[PDB]
């Protein structure tokens, strides 16, 4: 029996988490061998129902789709190409079916259903694996597409979710503050952790040059110039 998992993403973050969760849930205690693959990993077993157990362990945590090949019980799985700190975007029929979230979204955390979050207003949209792999996309970005910011002041606008504030902040670039004073009017959602001198990493939209098929529907006067993501150390 051979149960194999796959990623199509320029990097790996959900699997750098999977390695952590396997070591605390302990389902590899019976695997004959664990082989790194072109993008993921394969687990070897000698029985069938324990392979049925490992595929259900795989199903237990992350949204997936799972099928069965043969030669010896080959069970393949493809994984959602969505990571914690991504510029993700929901297609038209998917955002009406799921959540009525605006065209721009963020996936703050990963769970059994992939959750989405819009930078402008505060709402969570949980999504099962079926409809996504019925309508596959690749997100517009990953976690390796970031740059650093430097604030002067913070100003929480007072309303707040359990973990969000929709705070308006005045962000300022590091090397630019010293040539120009480019400070924008951008609303932030995680603005409850930022302080009078610390650094946040953010997705610069106002110069980035992307490629995908979902940009031909929206308008160009509603795009935020900047959209931020979680903190590193401060």
């Amino acid at each position: 029996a051979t149960v194999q998992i796959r990623q199509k993403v320029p990097h790996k973050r959900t699997f750098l988490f999977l390695e952590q969760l396997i070591l605390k849930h302990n389902a590899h205690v019976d695997t004959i061998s664990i082989s790194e693959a072109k993008d993921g990993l394969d687990f070897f077993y000698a029985q069938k129902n324990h392979a049925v157990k490992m595929i259900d362990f795989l199903n237990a945590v992350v949204p997936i789709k799972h099928k069965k090949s043969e030669e010896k019980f080959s069970y393949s799985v493809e994984i959602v190409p969505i990571c914690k700190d991504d510029l993700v975007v929901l297609p038209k029929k998917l955002a009406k079916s799921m959540g009525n979230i605006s065209q721009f979204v963020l996936c703050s955390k990963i769970s059994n259903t992939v959750q989405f979050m819009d930078p402008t207003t505060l709402q969570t949209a949980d999504l099962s694996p079926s409809v996504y792999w019925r309508a596959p996309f690749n997100a517009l970005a990953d976690v390796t597409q970031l740059v650093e910011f430097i604030v002067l002041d913070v100003d929480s606008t007072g309303i707040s979710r359990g973990n969000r504030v929709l705070a308006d902040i005045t962000v300022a670039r590091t090397s630019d503050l010293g040539v120009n004073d480019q400070v924008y009017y951008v609303r932030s959602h995680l603005g409850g952790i930022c302080h009078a001198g610390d650094s946040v990493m953010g997705y610069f939209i106002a110069n980035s040059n992307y490629n995908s098929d979902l940009f031909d529907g929206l308008n160009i006067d509603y795009v935020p110039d900047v959209v931020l993501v979680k903190k590193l150390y401060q």
């Binding site: 980035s208 040059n209 992307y210 490629n211």
Partner: protein, 94 residues
């Protein structure tokens, strides 16, 4: 792939005829006007009971497209065209 948004390249302009800095962009098709002769013809041939009259293409087998660069010369704002190879990816180095 990656292509910087700028490059130094020959300009056929009446005044330059030299290598002058160019801003590159991707080539996007137009709008397919309704008053093009080969659309005023289609719209008439189709007009009636005959049915469909011209072919429609089904048997697509490609998976990419060639990429095409529109190169504007900064000091005479004239333009030029280049093509490249088939690519499943294309971004600029802005």
């Amino acid at each position: 792939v990656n292509v910087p948004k700028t490059r130094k390249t020959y300009c056929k302009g009446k005044t330059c005829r030299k290598h002058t800095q160019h801003k590159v962009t991707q080539y996007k098709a137009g709008k397919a006007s309704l008053f093009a002769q080969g659309k005023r013809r289609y719209d008439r041939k189709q007009s009636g009971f005959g049915g469909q009259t011209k072919p429609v293409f089904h048997k697509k087998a490609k998976t990419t497209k060639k990429v095409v660069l529109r190169l504007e010369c900064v000091k005479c704002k004239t333009r030029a065209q280049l093509t490249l190879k088939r690519c499943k990816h294309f971004e600029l180095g802005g």
